[PDB]
Design a protein around this motif. Structure first.
Motif, short mmCIF file in Angstrom:
data_model
loop_
_atom_site.label_atom_id
_atom_site.label_comp_id
_atom_site.label_asym_id
_atom_site.label_seq_id
_atom_site.Cartn_x
_atom_site.Cartn_y
_atom_site.Cartn_z
N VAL A 136 5.98 -31.71 -39.65
CA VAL A 136 6.28 -30.40 -39.78
C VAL A 136 7.41 -30.68 -40.69
O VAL A 136 8.41 -30.61 -41.69
N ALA A 137 7.76 -28.72 -40.60
CA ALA A 137 9.59 -28.54 -41.10
C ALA A 137 10.15 -27.78 -40.15
O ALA A 137 10.50 -27.33 -39.63
N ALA A 138 11.09 -27.89 -40.55
CA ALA A 138 12.15 -27.34 -39.80
C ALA A 138 12.79 -26.28 -39.96
O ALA A 138 12.86 -25.69 -38.79
N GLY A 139 13.23 -25.41 -41.06
CA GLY A 139 13.62 -24.25 -40.85
C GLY A 139 13.32 -23.26 -40.24
O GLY A 139 13.91 -22.63 -40.36
N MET A 140 12.27 -22.93 -40.68
CA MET A 140 11.24 -22.52 -39.73
C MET A 140 9.88 -23.44 -39.16
O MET A 140 8.97 -23.34 -39.51
N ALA A 141 10.31 -23.08 -37.97
CA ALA A 141 8.88 -23.58 -37.21
C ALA A 141 7.81 -22.62 -37.28
O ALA A 141 7.87 -22.19 -35.95
N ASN A 142 7.08 -22.52 -38.41
CA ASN A 142 6.10 -20.78 -38.02
C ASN A 142 4.98 -21.27 -39.18
O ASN A 142 5.04 -20.50 -40.38
N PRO A 143 4.19 -22.50 -39.16
CA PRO A 143 3.41 -22.35 -40.65
C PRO A 143 1.97 -21.96 -40.51
O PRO A 143 2.03 -21.23 -39.64
N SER A 144 1.42 -21.48 -40.99
CA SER A 144 -0.58 -20.83 -41.26
C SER A 144 -1.05 -21.93 -42.14
O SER A 144 -1.74 -22.14 -41.81
N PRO A 145 -1.14 -21.55 -43.09
CA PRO A 145 -2.18 -22.77 -44.35
C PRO A 145 -1.92 -23.97 -43.70
O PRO A 145 -2.78 -24.70 -44.28
N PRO A 146 -0.58 -24.91 -44.01
CA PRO A 146 -0.89 -25.89 -43.87
C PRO A 146 -1.02 -26.85 -42.63
O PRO A 146 -2.87 -26.80 -42.24
N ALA A 197 11.10 -23.66 -28.49
CA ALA A 197 11.47 -24.89 -27.44
C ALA A 197 11.82 -25.92 -29.18
O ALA A 197 12.68 -26.73 -28.88
N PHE A 198 11.25 -26.16 -30.18
CA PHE A 198 11.32 -26.87 -31.40
C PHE A 198 13.13 -27.00 -31.68
O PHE A 198 13.65 -27.68 -32.33
N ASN A 199 13.52 -25.44 -32.39
CA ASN A 199 14.16 -25.29 -32.66
C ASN A 199 15.44 -24.90 -31.96
O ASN A 199 16.69 -24.84 -32.33
#
Lengths: 30, 141, 148
Positions: free
Chosen positions: B12-22, B40-42
């Motif tokens: 995943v990725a840190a700066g924003m935990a809120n993907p949608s296409p990936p 929780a992640f952030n």
């Protein structure tokens, strides 16, 4: 016996000295 | 952990935990809660660093909510932002194209100390040899 | 497998651990996973690293070929599946302890821990051990004896 004369050495001593020693202090008393 | 039950890792990725296409939905939809990986992640994100590759496992049974776990980065990838070139060939590996940093490979591997079998941290290096002779890119030792 | 030139090394190496060792434990790994070894190698790890072993060999024909040397208390362990553990440095230590605590986390049987050698005998989990350096339990036996 003299208690200070057995603290000055009984805070500072070697290692394997003790390792072949206190598997047996348990014997004379306890 | 003395008993595995469910694990899918899709970095995943840190700066924003809120993907949608990936990932987005496909990261939480079978008793999993999309609302709680941003609660929780952030909470375990900003203590370290943000933006770059994050594989991951979560603790979801069919129990509504859950608790999130962390992991570790890929090791041949620490030869991208931790070496040079970001592909690996260009001339298919019929040609031995790449190029190494001998200094690195130990401390840059050592950064992955928490997921390796070698007792000798030097051993943990010898693993990175083949991990970094993955093309046939020689190290200027 | 290998011929003799190799069945001899697994001996000359493994028996100079007995000849130059400390403590011995026991265990039968029917279901011995690999998260199994992984762990116990970190334990050998804490317990130095690679100072420890477990070389499965219970071929009587092997890790008894190291016994009519020392520890002929093991003609009796060697039957069936076994996982022999030797100590070089370290106290006659904790090695003992986690094998029971490990296998008492299911982690497969422990041969009922048929036991081994420090004395020359058999079974019974003891922490009569790594108190070792608990000579402090003879330091507190000083001031408290001097005072009380």
């Amino acid at each position: 016996s003299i208690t200070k004369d057995q603290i000055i050495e009984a805070v500072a001593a070697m290692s394997v000295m003790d390792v072949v020693e206190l598997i047996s202090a348990m014997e004379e008393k306890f | 952990a003395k008993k595995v039950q469910a694990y899918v890792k899709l970095q995943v990725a840190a700066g924003m935990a809120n993907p949608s296409p990936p990932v987005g939905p496909a990261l939480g939809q079978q008793g999993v809660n999309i609302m709680e990986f941003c609660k929780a992640f952030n909470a375990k994100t900003d203590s370290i660093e943000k933006g770059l590759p994050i594989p991951v496992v979560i603790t979801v049974y069919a129990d509504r909510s859950f608790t999130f776990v962390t992991k570790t980065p890929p090791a041949a990838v620490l030869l991208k932002k931790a070496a040079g070139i970001k592909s690996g060939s260009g001339k298919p590996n019929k040609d031995k194209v790449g190029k190494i940093s001998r200094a690195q490979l130990q401390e840059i591997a050592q950064t992955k100390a928490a997921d390796m079998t070698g007792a000798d941290i030097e051993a943990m290096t010898r693993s990175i040899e083949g991990t970094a002779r993955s093309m046939g890119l020689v190290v200027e030792d | 497998m290998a011929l003799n030139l190799q069945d001899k090394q697994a001996i000359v190496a493994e028996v100079s651990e007995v000849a130059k060792g400390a403590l011995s434990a026991v265990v039968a790994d029917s279901r011995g996973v690999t998260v199994d070894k992984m762990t116990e190698l970190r334990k050998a790890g804490r317990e130095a690293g690679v100072y420890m072993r477990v070389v499965r060999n219970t071929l009587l024909r092997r890790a008894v070929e190291g016994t009519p040397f020392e520890c002929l208390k093991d003609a009796f362990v060697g039957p069936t599946l076994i996982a022999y553990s030797m100590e070089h440095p370290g106290a006659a230590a904790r090695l003992f302890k986690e094998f029971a605590k490990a296998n008492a986390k299911f982690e497969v049987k422990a041969a009922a821990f048929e036991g081994e050698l420090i004395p020359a005998s058999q079974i019974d989990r003891l922490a009569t051990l790594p108190t070792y350096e608990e000579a402090i339990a003879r330091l507190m036996a000083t001031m408290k004896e001097a005072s009380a």
